[PDB]
């Protein structure tokens, strides 16, 4: 939902893990991405595993 609990009222809901199951147990587990919203970056080096 993205409810602002710190400034206002309401119940905050946020997904962190995605569990894929079968009839017996768990088949695969994929965690939710951790978004890092920034304005300006002053970095020396970088290593990317996906894409920019």
């Amino acid at each position: 939902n993205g409810v602002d609990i710190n400034n206002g009222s309401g119940v905050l809901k946020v997904c962190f893990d995605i569990v894929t199951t079968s009839g017996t147990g768990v088949t695969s587990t994929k965690p939710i991405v951790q978004t890092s919203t920034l304005d300006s970056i002053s970095v020396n080096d970088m290593t990317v595993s996906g894409s920019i």
């Binding site: 079968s22 009839g23 017996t24 088949t27």
Partner: protein, 372 residues
């Protein structure tokens, strides 16, 4: 009780018109109306797809024949419309009122089967993939009831369409039943507000999607305690007299003067002449179902082919149907591939329908066959 939204008939002679001015300016189709009355559905037998039985429920407001009934549930069903894309869809049971008695008990028919009514489809359309038949069947320009969109799982309807008998003109009901048996899926009609926030319309769609895009097979057990009802269905139409007293007309007399030739079908599937048999009876059937067949000699004069006789004495698909109570230890929802264990015997198939009653929650299991 359950909540019910009562709307007047979704007449496509009215709603199919693309005159509605969208907030951006664009001209699109007319959106669904607001319920003329909010009532509560009581004393109900409500099916999910309407595979075998028609729904029946008494309603608080005095509904009439033609009206659309939307039964609401405070739960959500997630359908996988694309490989990764999963959409938040609200649980709905949409029906058309077919008849109301003196005591206001309405006979409800599942929206989809009530939509593809009286529609006939020639063999020419059935020659292509199953997607082409679904795209033909679901059209607001042809159907008795209004349709806005169709959600369909590409993998399940990817295969080549089932071959039609005599290449004749069949009804939309018979072809859908034949297709839904092979694909092991059943349709569910759902009323939901348009995906885009700009579009304020309430729309009706048909569902051919599942919780998993790439459906997986489940293995479960059904105990006798769940009030199990076992009955045998037939998917494919094949003949019932396994033994054939075949007569061939004599050319010289233009009559059936010559004696008949008897043909028996073995347990394996092959068809042989009865005289040619040299066995112990172990490879032959337990009961002899017989019929007398009359054939006319071809222009060439040769007797009719063994293979042509074989098709008429060939066996039909004996399929087991199981109707039982919902097990809370291992819940089974509609459109799930299952392998059911019942009284020491294994039955494989899918969950076709689901009845939401006041007393119980039951499932219709259809054994797809194709065992050896």
């Amino acid at each position: 009780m359950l909540e019910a939204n009562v709307y007047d008939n979704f007449n496509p002679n009215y709603y199919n018109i693309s005159d509605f001015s969208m907030p951006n300016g664009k001209k699109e189709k007319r959106g669904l109306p607001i319920p003329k009355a909010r009532c509560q559905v009581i004393n109900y037998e409500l099916w999910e797809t309407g595979y075998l039985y028609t729904s029946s429920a008494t309603l608080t407001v005095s509904v009439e024949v033609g009206d659309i009934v939307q039964i609401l549930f405070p739960e959500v069903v997630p359908i996988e419309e694309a490989l990764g894309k999963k959409k938040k869809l609200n649980l709905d049971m949409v029906y058309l009122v077919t008849d109301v008695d003196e005591s206001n008990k309405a006979t409800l028919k599942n929206y989809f089967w009530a939509m593809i009514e009286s529609l006939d489809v020639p063999n020419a359309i059935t020659k292509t993939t199953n997607f082409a038949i679904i795209d033909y069947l679901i059209d607001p320009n042809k159907n008795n009831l209004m349709s806005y969109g169709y959600f369909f799982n590409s993998s399940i309807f990817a295969g080549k369409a089932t071959i039609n008998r005599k290449a004749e003109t069949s009804s939309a009901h018979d072809v859908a039943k034949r297709i839904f048996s092979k694909v092991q899926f059943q349709p569910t009609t759902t009323i939901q507000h348009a995906p885009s926030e700009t579009d304020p319309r309430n729309l009706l769609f048909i569902n051919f999607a599942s919780r998993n895009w790439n459906r997986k097979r489940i293995t479960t057990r059904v105990d006798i305690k769940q009030s199990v009802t076992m009955d045998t269905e037939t998917i494919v139409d094949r003949s019932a007299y396994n033994f054939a007293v075949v007569f061939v007309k004599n050319k010289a007399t233009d009559d059936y003067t010559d004696p008949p030739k008897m043909y028996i079908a073995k347990n394996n599937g092959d068809v042989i002449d009865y005289s040619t048999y040299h066995g112990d009876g172990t490879d032959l059937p337990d009961v002899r179902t017989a019929k007398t067949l009359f054939y006319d000699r071809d222009d060439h004069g040769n007797p009719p082919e063994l293979s042509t006789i074989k098709v008429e004495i060939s066996p039909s698909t004996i399929v087991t149907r199981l109707i039982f109570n919902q097990n809370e230890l291992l819940p089974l929802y509609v459109n799930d591939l299952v392998d059911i264990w019942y009284e020491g015997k294994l039955y494989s198939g899918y969950i076709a329908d689901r009845v939401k009653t006041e007393f119980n929650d039951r499932l219709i299991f259809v054994e797809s066959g194709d065992k050896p």
